[PDB]
Structure formats: structure tokens, C-alpha cells
Coordinates of C-alpha atoms in Angstrom, one line a residue:
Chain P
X1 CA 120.4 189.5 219.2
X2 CA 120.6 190.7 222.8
X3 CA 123.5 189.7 225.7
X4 CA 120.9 187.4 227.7
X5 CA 119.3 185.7 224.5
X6 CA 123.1 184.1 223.6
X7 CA 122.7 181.0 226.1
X8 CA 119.4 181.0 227.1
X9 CA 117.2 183.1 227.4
X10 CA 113.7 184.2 227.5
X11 CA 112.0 188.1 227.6
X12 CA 110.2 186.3 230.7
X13 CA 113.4 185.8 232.2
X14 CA 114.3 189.6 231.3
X15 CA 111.5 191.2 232.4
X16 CA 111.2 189.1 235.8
X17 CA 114.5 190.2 236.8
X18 CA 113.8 194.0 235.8
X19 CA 110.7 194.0 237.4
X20 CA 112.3 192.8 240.2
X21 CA 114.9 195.8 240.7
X22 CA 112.0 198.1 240.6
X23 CA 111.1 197.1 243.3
X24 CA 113.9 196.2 245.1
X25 CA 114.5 200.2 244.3
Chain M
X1 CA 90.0 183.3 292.3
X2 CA 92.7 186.1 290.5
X3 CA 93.4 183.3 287.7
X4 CA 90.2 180.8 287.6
X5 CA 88.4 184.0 286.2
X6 CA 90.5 184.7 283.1
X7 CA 91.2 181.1 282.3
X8 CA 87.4 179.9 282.6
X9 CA 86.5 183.1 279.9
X10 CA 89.7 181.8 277.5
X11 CA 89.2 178.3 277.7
X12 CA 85.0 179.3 277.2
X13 CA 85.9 181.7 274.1
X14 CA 88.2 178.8 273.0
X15 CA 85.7 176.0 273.4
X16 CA 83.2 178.3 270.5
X17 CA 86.4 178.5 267.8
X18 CA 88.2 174.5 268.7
X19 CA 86.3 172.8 266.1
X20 CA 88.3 174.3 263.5
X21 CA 91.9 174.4 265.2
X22 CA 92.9 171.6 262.5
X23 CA 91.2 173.5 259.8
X24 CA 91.7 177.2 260.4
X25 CA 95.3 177.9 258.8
X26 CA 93.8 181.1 256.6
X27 CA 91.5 182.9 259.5
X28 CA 92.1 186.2 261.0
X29 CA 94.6 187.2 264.0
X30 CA 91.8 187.1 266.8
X31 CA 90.3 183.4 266.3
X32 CA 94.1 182.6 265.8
X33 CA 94.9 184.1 269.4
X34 CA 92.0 181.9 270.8
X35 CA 93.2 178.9 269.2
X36 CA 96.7 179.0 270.6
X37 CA 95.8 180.5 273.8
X38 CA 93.3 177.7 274.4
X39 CA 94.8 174.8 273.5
X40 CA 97.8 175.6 275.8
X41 CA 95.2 176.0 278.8
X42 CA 94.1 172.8 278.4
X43 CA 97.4 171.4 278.6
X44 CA 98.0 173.5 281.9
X45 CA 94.7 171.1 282.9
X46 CA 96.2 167.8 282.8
X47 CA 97.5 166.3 285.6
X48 CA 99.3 163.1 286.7
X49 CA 97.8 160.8 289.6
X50 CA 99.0 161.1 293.2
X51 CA 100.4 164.1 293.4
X52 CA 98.0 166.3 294.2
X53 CA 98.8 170.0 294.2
X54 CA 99.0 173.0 296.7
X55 CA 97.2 176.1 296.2
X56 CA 100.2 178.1 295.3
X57 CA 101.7 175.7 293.0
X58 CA 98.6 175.5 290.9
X59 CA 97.9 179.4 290.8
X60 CA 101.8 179.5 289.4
X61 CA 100.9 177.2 286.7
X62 CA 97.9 179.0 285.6
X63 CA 99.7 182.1 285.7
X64 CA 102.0 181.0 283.5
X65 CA 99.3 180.2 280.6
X66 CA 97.1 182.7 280.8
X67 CA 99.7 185.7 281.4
X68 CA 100.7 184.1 277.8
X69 CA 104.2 183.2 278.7
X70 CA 103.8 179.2 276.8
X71 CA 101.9 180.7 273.5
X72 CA 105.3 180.3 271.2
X73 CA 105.8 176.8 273.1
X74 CA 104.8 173.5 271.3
X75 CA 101.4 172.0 272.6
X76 CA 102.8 168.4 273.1
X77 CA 105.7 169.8 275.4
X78 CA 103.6 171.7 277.7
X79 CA 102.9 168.5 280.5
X80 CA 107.0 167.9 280.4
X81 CA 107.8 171.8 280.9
X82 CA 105.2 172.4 283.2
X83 CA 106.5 169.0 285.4
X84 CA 110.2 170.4 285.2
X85 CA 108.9 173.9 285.9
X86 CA 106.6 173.3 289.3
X87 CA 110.2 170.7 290.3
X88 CA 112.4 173.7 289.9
X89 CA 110.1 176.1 291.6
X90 CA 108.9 174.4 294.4
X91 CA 113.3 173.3 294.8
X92 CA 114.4 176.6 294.3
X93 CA 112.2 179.5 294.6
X94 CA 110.1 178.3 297.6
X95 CA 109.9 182.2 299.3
X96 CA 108.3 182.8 296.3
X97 CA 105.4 180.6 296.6
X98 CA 105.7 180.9 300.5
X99 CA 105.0 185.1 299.5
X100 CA 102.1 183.7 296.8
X101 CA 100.3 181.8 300.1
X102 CA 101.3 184.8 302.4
X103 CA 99.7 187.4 300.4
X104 CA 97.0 185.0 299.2
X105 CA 98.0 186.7 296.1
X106 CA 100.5 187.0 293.3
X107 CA 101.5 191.1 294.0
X108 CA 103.7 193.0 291.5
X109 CA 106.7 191.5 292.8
X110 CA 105.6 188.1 292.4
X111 CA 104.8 188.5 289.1
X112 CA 108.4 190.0 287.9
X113 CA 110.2 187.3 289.8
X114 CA 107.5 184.9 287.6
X115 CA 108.0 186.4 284.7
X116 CA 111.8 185.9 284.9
X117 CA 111.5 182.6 286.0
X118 CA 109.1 181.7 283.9
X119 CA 110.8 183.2 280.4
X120 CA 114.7 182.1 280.6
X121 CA 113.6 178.4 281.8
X122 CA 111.2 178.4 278.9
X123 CA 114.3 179.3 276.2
X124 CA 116.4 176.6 278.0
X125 CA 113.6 174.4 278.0
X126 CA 112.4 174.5 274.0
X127 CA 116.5 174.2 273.2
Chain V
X1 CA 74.5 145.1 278.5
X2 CA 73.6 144.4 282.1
X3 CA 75.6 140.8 282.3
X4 CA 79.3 142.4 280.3
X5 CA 78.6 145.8 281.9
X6 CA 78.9 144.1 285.8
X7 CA 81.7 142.3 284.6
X8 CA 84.0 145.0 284.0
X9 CA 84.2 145.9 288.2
X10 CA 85.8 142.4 288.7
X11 CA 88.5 142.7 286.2
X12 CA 92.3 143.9 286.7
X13 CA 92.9 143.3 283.0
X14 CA 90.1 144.0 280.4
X15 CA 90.8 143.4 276.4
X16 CA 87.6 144.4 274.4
X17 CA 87.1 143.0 271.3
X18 CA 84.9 144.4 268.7
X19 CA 83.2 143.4 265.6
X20 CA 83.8 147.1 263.8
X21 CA 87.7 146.5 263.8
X22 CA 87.2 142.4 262.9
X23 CA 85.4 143.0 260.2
X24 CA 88.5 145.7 258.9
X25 CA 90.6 142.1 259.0
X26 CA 92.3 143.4 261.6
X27 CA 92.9 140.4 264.3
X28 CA 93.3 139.7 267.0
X29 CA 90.5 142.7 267.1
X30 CA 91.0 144.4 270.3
X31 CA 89.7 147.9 270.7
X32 CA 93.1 149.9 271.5
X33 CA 90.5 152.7 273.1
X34 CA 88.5 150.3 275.1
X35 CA 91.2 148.3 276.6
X36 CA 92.5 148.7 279.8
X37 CA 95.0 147.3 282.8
X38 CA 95.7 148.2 286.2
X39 CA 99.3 147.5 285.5
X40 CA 99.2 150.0 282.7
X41 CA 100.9 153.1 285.2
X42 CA 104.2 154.7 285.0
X43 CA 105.5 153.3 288.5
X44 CA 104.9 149.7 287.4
X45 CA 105.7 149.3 283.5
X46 CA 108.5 152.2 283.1
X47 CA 107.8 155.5 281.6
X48 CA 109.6 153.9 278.2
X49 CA 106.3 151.6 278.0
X50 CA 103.7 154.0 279.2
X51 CA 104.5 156.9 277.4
X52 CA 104.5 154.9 274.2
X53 CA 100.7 153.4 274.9
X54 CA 99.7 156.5 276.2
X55 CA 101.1 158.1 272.5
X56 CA 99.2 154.8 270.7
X57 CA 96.1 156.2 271.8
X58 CA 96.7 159.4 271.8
X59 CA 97.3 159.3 268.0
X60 CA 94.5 157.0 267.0
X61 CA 91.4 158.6 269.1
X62 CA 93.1 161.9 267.1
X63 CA 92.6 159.6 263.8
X64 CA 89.1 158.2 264.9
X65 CA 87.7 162.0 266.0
X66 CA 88.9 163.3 262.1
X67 CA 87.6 159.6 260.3
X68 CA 84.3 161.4 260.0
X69 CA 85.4 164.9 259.0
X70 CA 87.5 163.9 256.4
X71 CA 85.3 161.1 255.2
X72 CA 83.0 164.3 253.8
X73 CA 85.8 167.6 253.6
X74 CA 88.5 165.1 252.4
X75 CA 91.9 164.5 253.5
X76 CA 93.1 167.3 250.9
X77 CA 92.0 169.6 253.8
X78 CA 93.8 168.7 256.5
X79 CA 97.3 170.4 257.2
X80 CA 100.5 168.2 256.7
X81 CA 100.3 168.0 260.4
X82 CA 97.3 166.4 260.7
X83 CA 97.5 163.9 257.4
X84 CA 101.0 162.9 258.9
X85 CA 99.3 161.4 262.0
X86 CA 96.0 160.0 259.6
X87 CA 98.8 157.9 257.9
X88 CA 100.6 156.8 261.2
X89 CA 97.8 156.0 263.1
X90 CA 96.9 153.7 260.0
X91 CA 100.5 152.0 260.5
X92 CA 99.6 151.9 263.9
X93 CA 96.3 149.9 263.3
X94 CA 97.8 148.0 261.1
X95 CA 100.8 147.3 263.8
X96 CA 98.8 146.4 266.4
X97 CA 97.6 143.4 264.2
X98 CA 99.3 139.8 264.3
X99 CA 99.3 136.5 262.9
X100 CA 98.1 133.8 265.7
X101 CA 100.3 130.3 266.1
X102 CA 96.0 129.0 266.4
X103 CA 94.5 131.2 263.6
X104 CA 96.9 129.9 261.3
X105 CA 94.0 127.9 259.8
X106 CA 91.9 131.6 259.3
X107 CA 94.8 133.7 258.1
X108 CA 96.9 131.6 256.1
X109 CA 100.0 133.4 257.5
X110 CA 102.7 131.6 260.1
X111 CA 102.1 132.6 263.8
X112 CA 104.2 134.9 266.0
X113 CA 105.3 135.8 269.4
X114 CA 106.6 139.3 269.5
X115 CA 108.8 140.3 272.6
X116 CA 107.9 142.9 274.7
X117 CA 111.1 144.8 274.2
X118 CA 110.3 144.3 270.1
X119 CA 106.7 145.6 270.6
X120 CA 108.1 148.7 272.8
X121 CA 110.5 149.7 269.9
X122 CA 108.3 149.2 266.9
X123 CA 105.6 151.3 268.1
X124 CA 107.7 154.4 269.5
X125 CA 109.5 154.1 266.1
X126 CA 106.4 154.2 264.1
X127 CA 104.9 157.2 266.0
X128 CA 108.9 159.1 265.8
X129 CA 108.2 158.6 262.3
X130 CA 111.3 156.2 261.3
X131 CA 108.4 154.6 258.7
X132 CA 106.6 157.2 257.2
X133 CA 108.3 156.4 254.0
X134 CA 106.8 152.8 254.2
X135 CA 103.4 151.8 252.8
X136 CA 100.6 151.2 254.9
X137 CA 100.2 147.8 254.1
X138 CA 103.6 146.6 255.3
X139 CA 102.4 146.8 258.7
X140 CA 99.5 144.6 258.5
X141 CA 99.5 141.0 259.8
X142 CA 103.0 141.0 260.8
X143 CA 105.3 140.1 263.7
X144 CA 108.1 142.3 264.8
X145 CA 108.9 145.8 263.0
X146 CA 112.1 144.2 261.2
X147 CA 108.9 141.9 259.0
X148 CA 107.1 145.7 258.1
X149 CA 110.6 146.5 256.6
X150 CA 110.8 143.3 255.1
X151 CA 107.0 143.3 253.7
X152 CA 107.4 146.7 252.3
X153 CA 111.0 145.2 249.7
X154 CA 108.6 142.4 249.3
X155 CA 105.9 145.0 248.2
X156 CA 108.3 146.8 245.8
X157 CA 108.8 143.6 243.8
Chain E
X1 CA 92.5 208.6 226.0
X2 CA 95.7 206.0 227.1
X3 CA 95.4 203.3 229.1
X4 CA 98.8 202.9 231.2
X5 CA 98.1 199.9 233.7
X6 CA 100.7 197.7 235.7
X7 CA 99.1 193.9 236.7
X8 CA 98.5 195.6 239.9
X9 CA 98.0 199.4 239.6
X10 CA 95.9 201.6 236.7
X11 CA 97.3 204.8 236.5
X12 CA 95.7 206.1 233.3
X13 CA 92.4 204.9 231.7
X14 CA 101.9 213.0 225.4
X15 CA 103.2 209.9 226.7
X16 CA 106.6 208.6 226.3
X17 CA 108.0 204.6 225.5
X18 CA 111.1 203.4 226.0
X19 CA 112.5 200.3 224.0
X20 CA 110.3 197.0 226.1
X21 CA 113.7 198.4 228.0
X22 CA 114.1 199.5 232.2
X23 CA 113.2 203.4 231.3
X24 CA 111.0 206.6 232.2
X25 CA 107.1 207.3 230.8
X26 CA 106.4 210.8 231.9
X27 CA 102.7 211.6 231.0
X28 CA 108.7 204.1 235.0
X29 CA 108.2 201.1 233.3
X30 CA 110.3 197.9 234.0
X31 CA 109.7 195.5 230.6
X32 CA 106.8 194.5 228.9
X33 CA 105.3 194.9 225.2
X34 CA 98.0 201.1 225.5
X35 CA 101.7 199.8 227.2
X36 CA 101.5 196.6 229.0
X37 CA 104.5 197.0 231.8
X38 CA 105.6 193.8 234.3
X39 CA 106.2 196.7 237.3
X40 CA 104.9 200.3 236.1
X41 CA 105.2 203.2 238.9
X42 CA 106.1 206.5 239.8
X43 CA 108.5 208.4 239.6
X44 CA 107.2 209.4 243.3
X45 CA 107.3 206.0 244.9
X46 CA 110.9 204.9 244.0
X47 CA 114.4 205.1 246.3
X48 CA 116.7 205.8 244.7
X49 CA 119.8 206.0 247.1
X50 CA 118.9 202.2 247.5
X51 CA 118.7 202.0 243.6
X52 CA 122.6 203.3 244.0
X53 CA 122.8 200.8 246.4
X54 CA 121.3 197.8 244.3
X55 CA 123.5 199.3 241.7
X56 CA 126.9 199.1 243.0
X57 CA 125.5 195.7 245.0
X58 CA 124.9 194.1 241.6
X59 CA 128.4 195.2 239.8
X60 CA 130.2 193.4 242.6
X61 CA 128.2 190.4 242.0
X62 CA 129.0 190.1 238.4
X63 CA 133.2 189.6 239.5
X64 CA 132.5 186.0 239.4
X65 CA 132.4 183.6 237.5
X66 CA 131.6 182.4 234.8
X67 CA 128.9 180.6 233.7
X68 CA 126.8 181.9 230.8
X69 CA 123.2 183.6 231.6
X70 CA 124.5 184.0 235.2
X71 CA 126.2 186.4 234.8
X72 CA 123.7 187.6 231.4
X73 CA 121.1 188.0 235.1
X74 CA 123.6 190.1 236.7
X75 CA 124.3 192.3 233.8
X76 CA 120.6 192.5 233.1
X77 CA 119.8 193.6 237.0
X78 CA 122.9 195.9 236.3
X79 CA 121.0 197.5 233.0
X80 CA 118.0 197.7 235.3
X81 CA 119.3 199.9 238.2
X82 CA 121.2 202.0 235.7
X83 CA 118.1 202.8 233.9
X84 CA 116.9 203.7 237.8
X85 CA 119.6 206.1 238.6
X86 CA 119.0 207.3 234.7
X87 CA 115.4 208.2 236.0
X88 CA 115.5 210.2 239.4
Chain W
X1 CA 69.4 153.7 263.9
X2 CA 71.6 152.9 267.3
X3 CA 72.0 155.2 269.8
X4 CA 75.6 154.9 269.1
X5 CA 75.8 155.6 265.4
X6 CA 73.4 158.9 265.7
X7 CA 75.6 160.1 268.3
X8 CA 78.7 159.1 266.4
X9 CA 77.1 161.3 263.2
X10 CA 75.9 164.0 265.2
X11 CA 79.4 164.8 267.0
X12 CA 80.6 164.5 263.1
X13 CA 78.3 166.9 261.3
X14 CA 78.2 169.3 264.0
X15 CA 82.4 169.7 263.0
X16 CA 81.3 169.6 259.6
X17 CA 78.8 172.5 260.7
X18 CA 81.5 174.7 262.5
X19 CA 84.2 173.6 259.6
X20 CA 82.0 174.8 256.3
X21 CA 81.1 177.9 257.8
X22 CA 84.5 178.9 258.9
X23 CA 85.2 178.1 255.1
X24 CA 82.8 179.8 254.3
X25 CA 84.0 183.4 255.8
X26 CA 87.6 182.4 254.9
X27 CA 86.8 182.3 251.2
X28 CA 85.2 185.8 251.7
X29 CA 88.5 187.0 253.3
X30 CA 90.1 185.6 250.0
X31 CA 87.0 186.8 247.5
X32 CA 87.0 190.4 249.1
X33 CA 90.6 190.4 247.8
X34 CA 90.4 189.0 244.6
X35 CA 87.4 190.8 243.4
X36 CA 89.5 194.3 244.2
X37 CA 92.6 192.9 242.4
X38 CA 90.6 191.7 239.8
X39 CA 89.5 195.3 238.5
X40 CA 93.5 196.3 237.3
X41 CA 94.3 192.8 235.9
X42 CA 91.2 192.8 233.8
X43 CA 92.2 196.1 232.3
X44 CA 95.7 195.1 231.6
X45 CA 94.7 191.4 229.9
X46 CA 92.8 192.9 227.1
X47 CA 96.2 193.3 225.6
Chain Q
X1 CA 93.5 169.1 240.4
X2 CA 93.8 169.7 236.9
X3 CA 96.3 166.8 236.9
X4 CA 94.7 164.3 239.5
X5 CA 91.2 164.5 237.3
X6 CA 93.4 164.2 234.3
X7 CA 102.3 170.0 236.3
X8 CA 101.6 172.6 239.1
X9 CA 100.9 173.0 242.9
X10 CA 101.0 175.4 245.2
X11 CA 98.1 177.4 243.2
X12 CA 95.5 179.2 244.8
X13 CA 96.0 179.7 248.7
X14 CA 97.9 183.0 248.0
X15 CA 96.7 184.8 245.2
X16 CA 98.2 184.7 241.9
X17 CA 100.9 187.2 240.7
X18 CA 102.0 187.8 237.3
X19 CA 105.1 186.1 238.9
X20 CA 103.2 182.4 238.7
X21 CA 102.2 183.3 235.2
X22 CA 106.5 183.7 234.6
X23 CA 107.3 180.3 236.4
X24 CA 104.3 178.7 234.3
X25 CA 105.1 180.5 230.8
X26 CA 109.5 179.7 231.4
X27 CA 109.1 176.0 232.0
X28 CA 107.4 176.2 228.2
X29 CA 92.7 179.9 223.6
X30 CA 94.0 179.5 227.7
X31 CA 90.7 177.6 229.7
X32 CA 89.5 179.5 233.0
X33 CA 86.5 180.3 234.6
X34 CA 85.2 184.1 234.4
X35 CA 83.7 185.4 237.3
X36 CA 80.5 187.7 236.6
X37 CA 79.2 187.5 240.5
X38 CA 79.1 186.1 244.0
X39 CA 77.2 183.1 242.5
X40 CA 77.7 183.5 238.4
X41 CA 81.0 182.1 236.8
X42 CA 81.5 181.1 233.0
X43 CA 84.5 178.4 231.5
X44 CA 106.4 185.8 223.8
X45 CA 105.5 188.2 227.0
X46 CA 101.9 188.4 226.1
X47 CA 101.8 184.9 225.9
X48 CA 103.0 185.3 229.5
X49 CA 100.1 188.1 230.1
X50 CA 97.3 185.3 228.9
X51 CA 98.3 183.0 231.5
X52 CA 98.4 185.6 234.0
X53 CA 95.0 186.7 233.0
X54 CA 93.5 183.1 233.3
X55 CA 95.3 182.7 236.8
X56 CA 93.4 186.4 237.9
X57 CA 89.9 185.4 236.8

């Protein structure tokens, strides 16, 4: 069990938000 | 005859693309540019009764369009700027237009002194 | 027609009637584009009053130039821009229509005057928008604007 | 033969996989599940002193507050741009 | 069969004319880029 | 459409992005049409991929 999947959440939510700092970077 | 040129062409090029002003949100930059170009020349072609205008004061409006200065500005407040604009022109700034009749032209000079005029009274203007 | 058409030369006031906009139910059924008065001119009614006929018909010969379009491409085309002034210009008909003290016997509905202050108002308020959250029908076969608002609680339930 | 495709760019049609987690596949992928990858690049194309930037940007966000999965975001963006700086 | 109505649908259709092929190039503008970014997305849904 | 013949909007004036396939898949055989030609068409992350793939085609 992983940090973000405690309240909430998803591996859409996850990868959204990774996918975003990529290319943010 | 240094302003009826360009705006008979715009307003021509214009009259090929207006059917789809209402319907040509996705289109391409160009037909865009004719769009808003001509639908602010038309404005700049309508006119209240019994005041007709000297030569001068008509070849400063024109100007005005077809130099580009009113292509951010709002359609609908064209005939209210353009009213407030000739007022404050013909009040203020009548060596100006005395120098557009002299030189039967607008020279370089004319057209900086315009484009000054024409640019800060549009930002108060669209406040 | 040769007998209406040299009429029209020896009129200061003209109100056209016409059987397209009757037969909508829309009465009294005055063409708003076909109408005309030589009192109708900044100088003599106030700028208040003309600018808010000249905006009346403005907005519906842009409604009855789209009709057409629309009727085939569908309204789903046309830009919030342009479906906002389809819908007011359809409050705006609808406006423009009034119960008759002498057509009570036609309508069914009470007759009423309306002021020309009261007509001024509700029309530059319809075309500012102040309704656009009203339906349609709350404008029809009313009186003042204050009956619209009134008609569209009514509407509700 | 692997296929290593983002949505938008194919890049491929030894490898390395990294659990998916923010890591490096020398022949970057974001997340995802041939590797399926949400944003999938090089390597070439990615800066870098901005990912320091988005880095130490995203640790002062997380000073909050307080609310759960908030918070689990910022800590996830943080996990992100470590695994950035982790790359270059 | 008026006058009046044929020039009323002719001023309509010739919009209609204008409109549809202005559509027409616009969903080629859209097409041109969908077909393109169609080729990598069809390689990454077979997973 | 789907919904007025039968919730989303906002679908199809931009293209898709995966990104509209995450807003879809987070609020939770996929039916599309398959283009072929200029004329021709047919009717827990990879679930995410599918509806990404339907939005593409």
C-alpha cells in the first residue's frame, strides 16, 4: 500500500501528476 | 486617393471571406486577419445624418482602420470611438488636419502625431 | 402593389403589418424591420429611445439573416455569441407582442397600455441581458417587463 | 525487437524498467504499465536546472497543510522531480 | 414560387454554400492532424 | 451527443490527449469508430489507455 492510495487515490491520479513534472522539467 | 485604395482592396478581400465571420472560429491566421480587418472598415463606413464631413477628417478616420490601429477594438464600439475621436481631433489637434489639407497628404509626421493620438485615446477609450 | 406602394410617400408614420409574423401568434403583428417614423431621430426622441430601436432592429435583422442558416447547419454551430442574440432577439419578438383592451375577445388575455418610459426600459434591459435567465415564453403576450418576470414564477409552478 | 512508445512519440519499434515509478530506460519514463509510459522521452530533451527548480518549488509547497491526498500530490510531484535530478 | 421566397432561399443557400465549404477545409486542417497523431497512438493502444 | 441522442463536453474541437482519457477514467469492449480512409470508417491504467485509444480513433 502506497502514500497516495491511503485517502484516495487512483494510479490515474499518480501518473497524471508524474507525467506532468516531466514536462514541466 | 492614399487611403480609398487600400480600404476598397480590404473591404473587397473581406466581402469573399464575410459569409463565414459567425462560423469561422477554427480557420487559419490570414482569413482571420480579413475578418477582423473588414468588419472594422465597415464600421469606419457608417455615418450619422447632417453632419457631413471634410476631406481631412474623413482621410483621418480611414487611416485609422486600415493602418490597423482599431483591430483589438470591439466591433460595436467603433461608431462611439470614432464620434469621440473626430470631436477630440478636430478640438484639439486642428494643425494637424490643417497640415493633412495643406499637404494634401498625410507625410511621416502626420502619421507619428496619428499614431500617438490615435493609440493612447484608444486605451482610454476601451477602459 | 401599385395602390400600398404610392401610399407610403404620403405617410410621416408607417406601421406594416404582416401575415408571416400573425400567423406566429404574435399581435399586434407589426413588422419591426418594415416600420418606420419621421420622428424616429436622435434630436427629437432622445438618444435613450433611439439607440434602443436602433439596437431592436439591429438584433433581430442579425436573428432573421441566421433564421435560414441555422434552420439547415443548426444552432449547435453558432458561437455563444451569436446563439446569445438568437435567444434575445426571440425575447425581443416575443416583447414586442401585447394584449389589446379590443382583442380581448381573440386572445382571451386582459388588455394593456404600456408607458413609454416602461417600454424604453424593458427593451434596453432585454437586449443588456438582465433576462437571459428567463424563458422565452415569459415574454409573450404581456404588458410591461415586471409581467415577463411575473409569467416566468408563474411558469415554474 | 521492443516497442518503446509514449501516446505521442515512438521511439523504438538491453532495455531497462523502473518500478511503473518516475525513472531512467536507457536503450525516461514518467508512470505507466513493450512498456506503455504516460510521458516517455529523452534523456536529451529534458531541463534539468528547472527540474531543481520544480524540485525545491514543490518541497515548499508541501509546508502546508493538511488535508489528506493534497499533500499525497505534492509528495508525489516531489518523488517525481527527485527521480528527474536522479536521471541527468 | 414568389419572387420573394426564391430570393429569400437563394441569399440562404448561397451562406450555406460559403459555410460547408469553409467546413469543409477546416476539418482538413483538423484531419491532416489527427491522421499524423494517429500513427503513435495506434502503436501504443495495442497494449 | 452521445447523451442528447441517449456525461461529457468539451470533446472534439481540440484533439484528444491521454489527459481526457484521465479526467474520463478518474470520475469512474469501449464503442468508437475506426478510421481506415478519407471516406471508410468502422464502429487500472490500461483501462485508462482503452479510453484513450477510442478518443484517438
Amino acid at each position: 500500500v502506497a502514500y497516495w492510495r491511503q485517502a484516495g487515490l487512483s494510479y490515474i491520479r499518480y501518473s497524471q501528476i508524474c507525467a506532468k513534472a516531466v514536462r514541466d522539467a | 486617393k492614399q487611403v480609398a485604395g487600400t480600404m476598397k482592396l480590404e473591404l473587397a478581400q473581406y466581402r469573399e471571406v464575410a459569409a463565414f465571420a459567425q462560423f469561422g472560429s477554427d480557420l487559419d491566421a490570414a482569413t482571420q486577419q480579413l475578418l477582423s480587418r473588414g468588419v472594422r472598415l465597415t464600421e469606419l463606413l457608417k455615418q450619422g445624418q447632417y453632419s457631413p464631413m471634410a476631406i481631412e477628417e474623413q482621410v483621418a478616420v480611414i487611416y485609422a482602420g486600415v493602418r490597423g490601429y482599431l483591430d483589438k477594438l470591439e466591433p460595436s464600439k467603433i461608431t462611439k470611438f470614432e464620434n469621440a475621436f473626430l470631436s477630440h481631433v478636430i478640438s484639439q489637434h486642428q494643425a494637424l488636419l490643417g497640415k493633412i489639407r495643406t499637404d494634401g497628404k498625410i507625410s511621416e509626421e502626420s502619421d507619428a502625431k496619428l499614431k500617438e493620438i490615435v493609440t493612447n485615446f484608444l486605451a482610454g477609450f476601451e477602459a | 402593389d401599385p395602390a400600398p406602394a404610392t401610399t407610403f410617400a404620403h405617410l410621416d408614420a408607417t406601421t406594416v403589418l404582416s401575415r408571416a409574423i400573425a400567423e406566429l401568434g404574435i399581435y399586434p403583428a407589426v413588422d419591426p424591420l418594415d416600420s418606420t417614423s419621421r420622428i424616429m431621430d436622435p434630436n427629437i426622441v432622445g438618444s435613450e429611445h433611439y439607440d434602443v430601436a436602433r439596437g431592436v432592429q439591429k438584433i433581430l435583422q442579425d436573428y432573421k439573416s441566421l433564421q435560414d442558416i441555422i434552420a439547415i447547419l443548426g444552432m449547435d454551430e453558432l458561437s455563444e455569441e451569436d446563439k446569445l442574440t438568437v435567444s434575445r432577439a426571440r425575447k425581443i419578438q416575443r416583447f414586442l407582442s401585447q394584449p389589446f383592451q379590443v382583442a380581448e375577445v381573440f386572445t382571451g388575455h386582459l388588455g394593456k397600455l404600456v408607458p413609454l418610459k416602461e417600454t424604453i426600459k424593458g427593451f434596453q434591459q432585454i437586449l443588456a441581458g438582465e433576462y437571459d435567465h428567463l424563458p422565452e415564453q415569459a415574454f409573450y403576450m404581456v404588458g410591461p417587463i415586471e409581467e415577463a418576470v411575473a409569467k416566468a414564477d408563474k411558469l415554474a409552478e | 525487437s521492443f516497442t518503446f512508445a509514449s501516446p505521442t512519440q515512438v521511439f523504438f519499434n538491453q532495455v531497462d524498467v523502473p518500478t511503473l515509478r518516475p525513472g531512467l530506460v536507457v536503450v525516461f519514463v514518467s508512470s505507466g504499465s513493450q512498456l506503455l509510459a504516460e510521458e516517455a522521452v529523452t534523456l536529451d530533451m529534458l531541463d534539468l536546472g528547472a527540474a531543481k527548480a520544480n524540485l525545491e518549488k514543490a518541497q515548499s509547497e508541501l509546508l502546508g497543510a493538511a488535508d489528506e491526498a493534497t499533500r499525497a500530490e505534492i509528495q508525489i510531484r516531489i518523488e517525481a522531480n527527485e527521480a528527474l535530478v536522479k536521471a541527468l | 414560387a414568389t419572387l420573394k421566397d426564391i430570393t429569400r432561399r437563394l441569399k440562404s443557400i448561397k451562406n450555406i454554400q460559403k459555410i460547408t465549404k469553409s467546413m469543409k477545409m477546416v476539418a482538413a486542417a483538423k484531419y491532416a492532424r489527427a491522421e499524423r497523431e494517429l500513427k503513435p497512438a495506434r502503436v501504443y493502444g495495442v497494449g | 451527443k452521445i447523451r442528447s441522442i441517449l456525461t461529457f463536453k468539451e470533446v472534439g474541437r481540440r484533439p484528444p490527449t491521454f489527459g481526457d482519457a484521465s479526467v474520463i477514467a478518474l470520475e469512474l469492449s469501449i464503442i468508437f469508430n475506426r478510421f481506415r480512409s478519407v471516406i471508410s470508417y468502422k464502429t487500472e491504467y490500461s483501462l485508462a489507455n482503452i479510453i484513450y485509444y477510442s478518443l484517438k480513433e
